[PDB]
Amino acid sequence: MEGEMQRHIKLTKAQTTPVVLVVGDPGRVDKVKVLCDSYVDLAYNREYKSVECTYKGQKFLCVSHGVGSAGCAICFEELMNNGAKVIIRAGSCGSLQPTQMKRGDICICNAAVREDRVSHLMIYSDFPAVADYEVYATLNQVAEELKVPVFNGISLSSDMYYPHKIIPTRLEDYSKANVAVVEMEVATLMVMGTLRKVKTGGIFIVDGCPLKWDEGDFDNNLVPERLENMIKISLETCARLAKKYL
Amino acid sequence: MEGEMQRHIKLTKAQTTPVVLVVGDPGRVDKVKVLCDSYVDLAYNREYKSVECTYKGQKFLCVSHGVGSAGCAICFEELMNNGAKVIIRAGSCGSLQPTQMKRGDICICNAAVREDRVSHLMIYSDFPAVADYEVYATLNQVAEELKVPVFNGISLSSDMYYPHKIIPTRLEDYSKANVAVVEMEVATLMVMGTLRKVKTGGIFIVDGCPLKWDEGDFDNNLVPERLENMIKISLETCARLAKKYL
Amino acid sequence: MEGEMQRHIKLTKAQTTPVVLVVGDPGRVDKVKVLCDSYVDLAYNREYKSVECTYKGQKFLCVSHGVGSAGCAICFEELMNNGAKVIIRAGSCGSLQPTQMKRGDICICNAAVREDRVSHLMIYSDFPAVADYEVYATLNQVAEELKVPVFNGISLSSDMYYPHKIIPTRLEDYSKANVAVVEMEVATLMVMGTLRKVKTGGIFIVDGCPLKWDEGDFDNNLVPERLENMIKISLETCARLAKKYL
Amino acid sequence: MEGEMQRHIKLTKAQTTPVVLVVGDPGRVDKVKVLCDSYVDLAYNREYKSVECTYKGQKFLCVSHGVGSAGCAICFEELMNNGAKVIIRAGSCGSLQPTQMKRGDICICNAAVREDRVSHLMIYSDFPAVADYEVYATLNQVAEELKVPVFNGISLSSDMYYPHKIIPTRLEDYSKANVAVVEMEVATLMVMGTLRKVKTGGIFIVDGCPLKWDEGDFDNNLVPERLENMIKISLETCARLAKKYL
Amino acid sequence: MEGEMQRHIKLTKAQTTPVVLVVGDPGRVDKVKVLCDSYVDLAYNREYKSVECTYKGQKFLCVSHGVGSAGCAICFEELMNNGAKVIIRAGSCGSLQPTQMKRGDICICNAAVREDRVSHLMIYSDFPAVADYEVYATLNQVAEELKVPVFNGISLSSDMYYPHKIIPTRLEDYSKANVAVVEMEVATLMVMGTLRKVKTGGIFIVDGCPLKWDEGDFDNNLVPERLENMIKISLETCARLAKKYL
Amino acid sequence: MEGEMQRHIKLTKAQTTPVVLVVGDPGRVDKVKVLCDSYVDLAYNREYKSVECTYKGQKFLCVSHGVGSAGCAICFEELMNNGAKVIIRAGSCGSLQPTQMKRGDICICNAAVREDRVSHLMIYSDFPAVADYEVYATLNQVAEELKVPVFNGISLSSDMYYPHKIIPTRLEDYSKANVAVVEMEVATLMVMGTLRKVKTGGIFIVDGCPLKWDEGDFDNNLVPERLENMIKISLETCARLAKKYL
């Protein structure tokens, strides 16, 4: 008898909770778990590190997915294979509204620009990348109760981090179209969610200013403390939803 | 001195309320207005019929936009030109989930498939067609308070009503992708909304079964009564939002 | 026993003549009909107003189709469903050759740029939007006999009326490509025509200068008189063709 | 002092008539010229063979362009560079309506499907490939006077002659869309014509049945005699138009 | 004074050798390094694990890049930022020629299908994904000297691992087009290489049969021994090239 | 009994050697053949002129294909139909690296940009246009032995020779992407090769400076002597490969 695991994340159905918090950095999993009530280390294969969190009485996984849409898609498909019903991406982003949203600001995302490939391999470009509206609402509610100021908006999910010389990026064009922030994974998660009837959402902390003006600190110590707040919102939200899902 | 009107809808800024309810049929405007507390007929040009509704103490317009994305886009741009802050499309749709959603069922829509052209003339296909999440939430809340059962889902907004022989439609493909309903305008409204910082949403009554099995009654007497309920939700929602917008 | 009607235009086969004149504005139907020998009001549903014209001994319909490709496509499919053999669009346009074609000038169109969606839902982009060459020839002949000066050229049929900020329109690019005028429907009509073996064409009066320089009068009183001439050419052409079609 | 020639066809402005008949096969130039009143051999470089025809009192060139859109485009650009005002393609095609149009039948073409690349390098796919309507009308008129039965229709201009195994051709799809015939050059000519204000058209003899059923004779002796008729129509048309162009 | 590192891989220019071997699995770095003469652990951040290999007298890095095109692109851009002149991807693949290439077989790749997004964000789809031909030649030469049988061919680089229900994958289509193997990263590497004047190539071991028939062993213990051979070829090749690059 | 020929090139299987040298200009065939040991004129139909070369003891064809991708594709498909195993394109090109590669310089090409249509009619754009690496290697080896300096690089294969006014060419963009040279046929050959398991490659002499600066001599006397060298490399390479293929 074997524990029958998913190929890449190496988790079984039985280890997989209804609710899963996903992060990009495997190093983020260890930081998240220290803020929980208790945890159980599960698996660490490739970039896919898995813990069971207990937080505010509730069990849910935290799982790292790596950088970028194709790599994270493998994580997300395998979690959904294992029965996940709710997946929330918690991460860093760049601000596309640099006068309004600065380093440290937190953005809760209802939808995303699909500048990947894998979503297009699932379904036609016309199809919207959209959060589940209960998951989005819950993140907002929790942030309000914790008195943590948040922005809401669309994310640009772009497979390109480093620009080349020949053709422009769409960072400015999407800023003009009122897209809030930019990162690399949430469109892929949202589309796959809708397609597989798994509820998804996204919360992000601004740690990058890819347009222009401002700041610092270089990174990824992100920012402290504003970072803690975003993680707490994430954990509180995951707990509230795992209650729905017993 | 002239009252300075928008070219097609023939309304002035001063006549345009923060909240506007949009319908496809100019004949629907007259049906909506009879369910209000009071109304003022405004203008009727081309397919664009305009009334000011008073309902539950609040003023907001009801405006017809005609069939199809390019024609309704003219309506919507001109309303936004005049200062509309909230536009809600209330209409008929076909069911893409015919085992689950039948004639008479009401669907409140958070997002849409962009099978138009004009949204693509505004912004790249990758960009999501998405409702404002406050508008979506308010429609749901009102429906719950009125004890009217509702579905939630994505709409396919397709410029094609009558299929041709050569290439398939994507009606089945989008059904498989868990798209709830199909109509012809809401993607165009949602994208333009996001682009112009105008809050939008969509509520629809199933009056068509474009896949296959079922029913009737032919149309558009729609259905009575279930129709009344959808209109009431619309009107109640518009009132609740116009309160926010004094 | 019912008179079995098309869903949107509400006309029966028996009411539908071989030749149909289509206009955008339902208000235009009433203006056209006053210039005929006699008429019979048929139906008025949504933006679709229908009259039978008698002009110079011949019977043919005048039918309004509303603004924009998806809405007019419903009109045109339903007319073709009812046996129409010839459909001519008579309308307003903008000049893309503003030094050459001014307000009041009339353009008879042999082909169009397909900047819609619905034609692309019928057939691949490579396929030409083209008038029937008998219909085009007849409009020219009638104009010559009536000593009304006309231009000939390609129309840009664009689903976008109001530009957005992010991506350019192709109005200038198509001007450089020697496209004469711009409107919103005739490409859709032409493609559907070819596909369904229905003869089509387009005549337009310049009432807009969307590039730049010039003029006036704002609109849509169009222009008088030059407007009358375009309508007369339309009516004379429809009569000449209905003779072919007894 | 040099006679300043175009790079590929090696003709000067002074040698280039307002009207030019173009054929694919350089061997066709020699066959055409024997049916004229008199000729002057001009140049033969690469696949580009050039003669001045005199026919029915009028001078015009016959020029070979080779097989396929990119090669013929070089011919056509260089002729237009030299002042050609009218270019007519006279050639062979396959029947896409094999019940209606058989080997030997002649088709006069008003428009074409753009299944090339070079037209797309000139202008967006939405733009129609269309004959000048005077050139099309003249071919028809001449055929009628010569009592030669002709078909009229759209041509599929396809860069692919030999199909591969992986993706289908659009031969059947375009047959279903009522495209008459298939060849390899006329879309490219038509678009370039419109773009450069040069009047174009196409007449073709069915020598191929690429769908299926029928026939023979293998080719390219084409067919005799029906072939002569198509060439005569071509020559007569070229003469009639060169008269317009003194 | 800081050692100035690349953001994600956390390596400095001074730590970065002209030649770099890239692998997907950070666990593969530890397996590679045990087969070298000596090593120096450098950095481990996110999925990016870095060692300096010494093998056969020569120094070159081995660096993990994670699963999938967008994540690995960050690795590759940062290595090129640091002066890498040669990057070779050594990994696992699936066989697209399952009668010819089986589990354990090794394929040296000269080119790839670009089924990513990020390469398309760099340059137009028309642009070829191609290995440097010296790097490809060297891998072949080394394999021949080591008497290790190898296949040569094109790789399909696909961002999709798990298929969805709505639209087909192109795995079969590309098999029919004589594509050898399928993996997820090498197209992205090849294009970026050409664009930045960095020499690239790919060697892969078949550990997957995504079409159909065959086998086993499940994975990723890959296969032993055939795996060792592929790694040895990789290491020998890297050494031979680092000699060129002192 | 007939010698059963391919439709356009008019060659039989028995006349077709394993190795074929292809040139654009039928006039080039006569120039090539004079540099061989002996030849046999085979066929001359349309732009397709065919000779059997004997050079350095070996037999292989030289065949002209005309200008441009669709016309040459017919040549290449028919040669492959007849059993050709190796086809090498030898021709002229323009320099896209005008500081580095000048008139007279010779470029041996491993890959190409697919700016045709016919390759896209065979297979999806993502698929690479790539030379066989043995053919590429052999051209290089022969050039080295003959002490003829050569460049190596990617070719832009573009169906457009004469630019139009509306949309830019990609000549500069591809120069920035490190594409070496530009011509009109080799991408089409490479893709078809891979698809049909026929080994291909390309060698070119710079006779054009389509960017800008420089030179002369106008053309196509190309250049002497540097031209002879490129032809000799071609012939030597063809001989070396025909030896492999007895």
Numbering used by the authors:
A (entry chain A), B (entry chain A), C (entry chain A), D (entry chain A), E (entry chain A), F (entry chain A): 1 to 246
Paper text:
Purine nucleoside phosphorylase (PNP) is central to purine salvage mechanisms in Plasmodium parasites, the causative agents of malaria. Purine nucleoside phosphorylase (PNP) in Plasmodium forms a key enzyme in the recycling of predominantly host-derived purines, catalysing the phosphorolysis of inosine to produce the major purine precursor for the salvage pathway, hypoxanthine, and ribose-1-phosphate. Crystal structures and sequence homology studies have distinguished two broad families of PNP enzymes: those that form trimers (such as the mammalian PNPs, Type 2) and those that are hexameric (such as E.coli PNP (EcPNP), Type 1). Crystallographic studies of PfPNP have shown it forms a hexameric assembly suggesting its closer alignment with the Type 1 PNP group, although functionally it has been noted that, unlike other hexameric PNPs, adenosine is not a substrate for PfPNP.
The PvPNP crystal structure was refined against 1.85 Å resolution data and the model contains all of the protein residues with the exception of the disordered active site loop (residues 212–224). The crystallographic asymmetric unit contains a monomer of PvPNP which adopts the familiar single-domain fold topology described previously for hexameric PNPs from other species. The nucleoside binding site of the PvPNP enzyme in this structure is observed to be empty although there is electron density consistent with three bound water molecules within the substrate binding site. Additionally, an anion – presumably sulphate from the crystallisation buffer which contained 0.2 M LiSO4 – was identified and this anion occupies the phosphate binding pocket of the enzyme. When the R32 symmetry operators are applied, PvPNP is seen to form a hexameric assembly that matches the arrangements previously reported in crystal structures of PfPNP and EcPNP. Presumed to be the biologically-relevant structure, this hexamer is a disc-shaped single-layer with an overall diameter of about 100 Å and a thickness corresponding to the width of a monomer (approximately 50 Å) with an empty central channel of diameter 20 Å. The hexameric PvPNP appears to be assembled from a trimer of dimers, where the dimer pairs are related by a crystallographic three-fold symmetry axis running through the central channel, corresponding to the view in Figure 2. In common with PfPNP, the phosphate/sulphate binding site of PvPNP is formed mainly by two arginine residues (Arg 89 and Arg 46' from the neighbouring monomer), a backbone interaction with Gly 24, and both backbone and side chain interactions with Ser 91. Another arginine, residue 27, also lies in this region, but points away from the bound sulphate in the PvPNP structure. The composition and structure of the base binding pocket in PvPNP is essentially identical to that described for PfPNP, whereas there are substantial differences when compared to this region in the PkPNP structure.
